Amino acid sequence: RAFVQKLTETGVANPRMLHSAPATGALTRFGEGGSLTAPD
Amino acid sequence: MREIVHIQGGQCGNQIGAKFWEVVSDEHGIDPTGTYHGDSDLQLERINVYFNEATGGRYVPRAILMDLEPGTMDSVRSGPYGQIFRPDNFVFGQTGAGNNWAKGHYTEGAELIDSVLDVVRKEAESCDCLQGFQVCHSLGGGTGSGMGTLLISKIREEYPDRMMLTFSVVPSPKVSDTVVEPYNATLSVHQLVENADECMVLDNEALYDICFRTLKLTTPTFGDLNHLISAVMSGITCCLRFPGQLNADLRKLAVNLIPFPRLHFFMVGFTPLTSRGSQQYRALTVPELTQQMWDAKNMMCAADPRHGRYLTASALFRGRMSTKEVDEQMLNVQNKNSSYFVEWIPNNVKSSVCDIPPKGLKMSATFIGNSTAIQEMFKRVSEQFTAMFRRKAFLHWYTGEGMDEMEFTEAESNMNDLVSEYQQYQD
Amino acid sequence: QPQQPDGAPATVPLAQSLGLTQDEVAGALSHPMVHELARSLYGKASGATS
Amino acid sequence: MREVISIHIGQAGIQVGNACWELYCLEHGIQPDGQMPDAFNTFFSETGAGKHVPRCIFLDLEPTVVDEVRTGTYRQLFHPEQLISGKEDAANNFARGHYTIGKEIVDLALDRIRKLADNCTGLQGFLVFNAVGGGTGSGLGSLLLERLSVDYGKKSKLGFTVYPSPQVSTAVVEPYNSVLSTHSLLEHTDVAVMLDNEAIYDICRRSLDIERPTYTNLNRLIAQVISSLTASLRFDGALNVDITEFQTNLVPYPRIHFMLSSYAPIISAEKAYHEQLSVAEITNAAFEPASMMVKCDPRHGKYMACCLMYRGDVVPKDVNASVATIKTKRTIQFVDWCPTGFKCGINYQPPTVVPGGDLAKVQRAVCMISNSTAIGEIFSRLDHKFDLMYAKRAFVHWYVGEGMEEGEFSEAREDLAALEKDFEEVGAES
Amino acid sequence: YHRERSNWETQAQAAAREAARLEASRTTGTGAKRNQGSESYNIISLNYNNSSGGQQLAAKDTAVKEARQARAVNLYSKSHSVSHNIITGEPIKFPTA
Ligand SMILES: Nc1nc2c(ncn2[C@@H]2O[C@H](COP(=O)(O)OP(=O)(O)OP(=O)(O)O)[C@@H](O)[C@H]2O)c(=O)[nH]1
Ligand SMILES: Nc1nc2c(ncn2[C@@H]2O[C@H](COP(=O)(O)OP(=O)(O)O)[C@@H](O)[C@H]2O)c(=O)[nH]1
Ligand SMILES: [Mg+2]
């Protein structure tokens, strides 16, 4: 169950973007409008 | 793959529902955080009946919590097994019904019913199949009584071919924490008799009597009363969640218990209740559970089973046991006192066996009784209603919210019509 | 989980028990065959564990 | 959120309000300056950082009591312009507080109420405190309840009014201001809680063993009645009974809205000697006729409805049993049409004790508010003294010349005649 | 950046304070004060709870057992007069298992 769950939650549709596998993003946050990124 | 959607209403339903989800989560091995840490493979096989799969392996209950004042949801969210519930299901009012059946039905219920219907449509349409709907509420109150009965009206109009199992706690003769229980209960039953497919009748005085005379508790609390309800509520769904030699859904218990559409008020009881002193001397055996099953003290209704004949009955045994003495024991009670059973229905009792007993018990059984003795608890509600309706007591509060005095009479007439067809089968 | 017998050997973990390399354990999910396995596991919604 | 706004009118209102808000501070740990060292939201609104101000106004025509609060032990607690004063008092006249001198001050009162109503998120009711004996509590109290009904429709109002005693009175125009104030609170005040002065003097004499009780000692335990009534809102309880719970469950008829008051455990600090009373004994004490806050015997009348407010460690079983034992008692008689009229409000915080107060620490307490037909003799006793003075037209020229017309005195009297009439026939068996 | 960072910090601090007080009320037992059972043992299955109340209940049960053992010793000792079984010559001992 953990095996299948981990493979399903790490699975991706396009195989060529898997090369990055071997900061969160704005749309994950959906808030902190003026606080996206930081100075310096 | 077939599921039950649970709806809790008001002060009573939220506390009863929180104890109900305390037991079935312990049965299926979900910790208060949410992760499955059970130690049985059969627990995980049927999770989808009561829990949704979430990310990270978490399970959230398929429950809708609704009320009209936010006091309950401060208490429910703060308790053990309390953070597993979805906050989107936490739909709340602000005014509070205040023990008024008309306030929850027409005035402030109406703005909240459109909100509670969207989350039911969100939860029922999210699955593949529905076994039915399970609701626990009160009749003497106002928050779960007036608002709950309109919810049953709209959900039956939208989903007409699905089961409706209601655990309604009725006003009590011995105890009474309110003044307008006969007003709210008579209006609730008049809305419930045509809409609810089946009904479990509960009361506080029978639960207090079980905790006192049978379970030997010196100072029982509402938590003790809600635990007896929770064991029975999980006992109805025993064959759904777990395999067995006999399988029975809510429709299996529906078809064997109502000869006619209007006789859908049952009385329930949980069998293996014993004080701590005599547990080692008592031999937990199928004749012992059957003896306590038909006993009048084990019933969780105000109706005395010796006064009225049982029309139909159901026994839901849990645990590894032989069906022969299961069948023979209910055969024995049909022949020992045949006057307590109806004559024109043969094989009055339905039996089903589940092979997974509850936690900490080797054997258990849940009893469902369709009895004509349940007319007597509705008469006392009707007797107290006619005590105050003839002098128009507390009626100006009800007519303020927009309900006329006319539909108190069809509420009165259908209460008297419901009991009148009960005595015609007792003879 | 059954309790281990007394005088247990205290067995070594699986990865370098069976001899996995650092490249394999780093790129276990990056292999195309593992990606196809994950795609089929996603496709089998509830029958993946069957 | 659950918020309540109380209004205190007249000399009795402010001095009760000094005593009641004294108890509300120590219940929530509020220091006298107004700084703590989520339950506080029902009575205190936090302003800025750490400053909590009461949700009440103190309006009085006489400036000699409001400045005592302004220089007393709670100067920093109240908002500086939340307390309303006047240049001259009504001087025991209902006509002055209603028409001539009450009109200029009442417009400033609604401005404070409207700003308090806008600040609170959800307002649940009004607790009005006034004395019908004096001019300011009667006249300005009647006008404030007149404007609050039109401005805030269908919102609940709780009336804690001090009626004159049959025996002990402090003024000769006590029945005149009481009769006229009764007409205003009949159709405007949703709940009237009966309070009497020397009935509490009897309670302090025989239970608190205070040989020389004062008005401050009277006001301390009448504050405990208000706190035990509102304790469901402030703290979590087994069976919460809100304000809107209370109206629809205690008044059977729209004009029968008068209820009695009783607080069950009353023991002095020395009189306790480390003992506790069970639930059944204090429930028997609440229905004891001499333990009530007004001088009416319930044996003559019959209990139309009842309400029990329990505090502290009370299990739900014995309070249900204590209801059953009271019902089987023959001395307490109930009306025939109401089979079950009791209530259970079980909060799980014991009532606190103020430092230096007469009341001792108790684990459990009962606040008993009950509708009964025994109030008919309460209105008849004020009617008996009023008819003696009105037949000779004594103490009337002050009322007539101050704007008020003569013919409305009979209009207020005939309403008490109707209020005496329907008390007899509703309690009559059918 | 300071302005909206302070705004989001106030929002998250309020949310975290609410979550922390709910978690504290959960772990101290104040939450669901309506629903805990008396005597700290499971009503349906006669088994001790996994809490300190259950541990103290087990301790009280052991103390009651010890007191009953003492009373049984007293009754046996002053029921038998001699250190000898009357029928068969045998030692007299307090029966335990
Ligand atoms: N129980 C109690 N009664 C009080 C208290 N203070 C005043 N009273 C009552 O009030 C009556 C005196 O009339 P008041 O209502 O105080 O007069 P007022 O409100 O100042 O009105 P004006 O004199 O016209 O300004 C007395 O008979 C008392 O019964 C108090 O602190 N406790
Ligand atoms: N078994 C049980 N009964 C309850 C509980 N809470 C309230 N009741 C009963 O319900 C009646 C009043 O219900 P009420 O609080 O008005 O329900 P509401 O409509 O949601 O406000 C009382 O007589 C109680 O005996 C509970 O947690 N468990
Ligand atoms: Mg004055």
Give the ligands present.
guanosine-5'-triphosphate, guanosine-5'-diphosphate, magnesium ion
Structural class of chain B: alpha/beta
Structural class of chain D: alpha/beta
> Helical amount among residues of chain D, as a percent range?
40-55%
User: Strands across the major sheet of chain D, in which order?
Assistant: 5-4-1-6-7-8-9-12-10-11
The profile of the biggest β sheet of chain B is: 10 strands, mixed
Helix content of chain B: 40-55%
How large a portion of the residues of chain B is in β-strands, by DSSP E?
Answer: 15-25%
Number of distinct helices of chain D: 15
Described by the principal axes of the CA atoms, the overall outline of chain D is globular
Largest sheet of chain D: 10 strands, mixed
Evaluate the radius of gyration of chain B.
Answer: 21 Å
- The order of strands across the largest sheet of chain B is 5-4-1-6-7-8-9-12-10-11
Q: Most extensive interface: pair and counts?
A: B-D, 36 and 35 residues
PDB class: structural protein
Keywords: cilia, microtubule, structural protein
Entry title: Ciliary C2 central pair apparatus isolated from Chlamydomonas reinhardtii
Chains A, C: Unknown protein
What can be said about this structure in brief?
With 430 residues, chain D is of the alpha/beta class. Helix content of chain D is 43%, strand content 17%. Chain D is globular, with a radius of gyration of 21 Å.
Report on this model:
The structure is cut from a larger assembly and holds 2 copies of chain A, 1 copy of chain B (427 residues), 1 copy of chain D (430 residues) and 1 copy of chain E (97 residues). Chain A has 40 residues and is mainly α. Chain A has helices spanning 2-10, 26-29. In chain B, helix 3 links the parallel strand 4 (63-66) and strand 5. Chain B has helices at 10-28, 41-45, 71-77, 101-107, 109-124, 146-158, 181-192, 204-214, 222-236, 238-241, 250-255, 286-293, 323-336, 375-389, 395-400, 407-426, and strands at 2-9, 51-53, 59-61, 63-66, 90-91, 129-138, 163-169, 198-202, 265-270, 310-318, 349-354, 364-371. Chain D is 43% helix and 17% strand. In chain D, the strands form 2 sheets. In chain D, strands 5-4-1-6-7-8-9-12-10-11 form a 10-stranded mixed β-sheet, sandwiched between helices. In chain D, helix 5 (135-151) links the parallel strand 6 (122-131) and strand 7 (157-163). With 97 residues, chain E is mainly alpha-helical. Helices cover 55% and strands 0% of the residues of chain E. Chain E starts with a helix and ends in a 20-residue tail after the last helix. The chains are: A mainly alpha (40), B alpha/beta (427), D alpha/beta (430), E mainly alpha (97). The A-E interface holds A 31-35, 38-39 and E 1, 3-5, 7-8, 11. The structure holds guanosine-5'-triphosphate (GTP), guanosine-5'-diphosphate (GDP) and magnesium ion. The site of guanosine-5'-diphosphate has 21 residues of chain B, from helix 1, helix 8 and helix 9. Guanosine-5'-diphosphate (GDP) binds at residues 10-12, 15-16, 99, 138, 140-145, 169, 177-178, 204, 207, 222, 225-226 of chain B. Chain D: GO terms for molecular function: GTP binding; hydrolase activity; metal ion binding; structural constituent of cytoskeleton. Chain D: Keywords: Acetylation, Cytoplasm, Cytoskeleton, GTP-binding, Hydrolase, Magnesium, Metal-binding, Microtubule, Nucleotide-binding. Chain D: GTP binds at residues 11, 62, 135-136, 170, 197, 219.
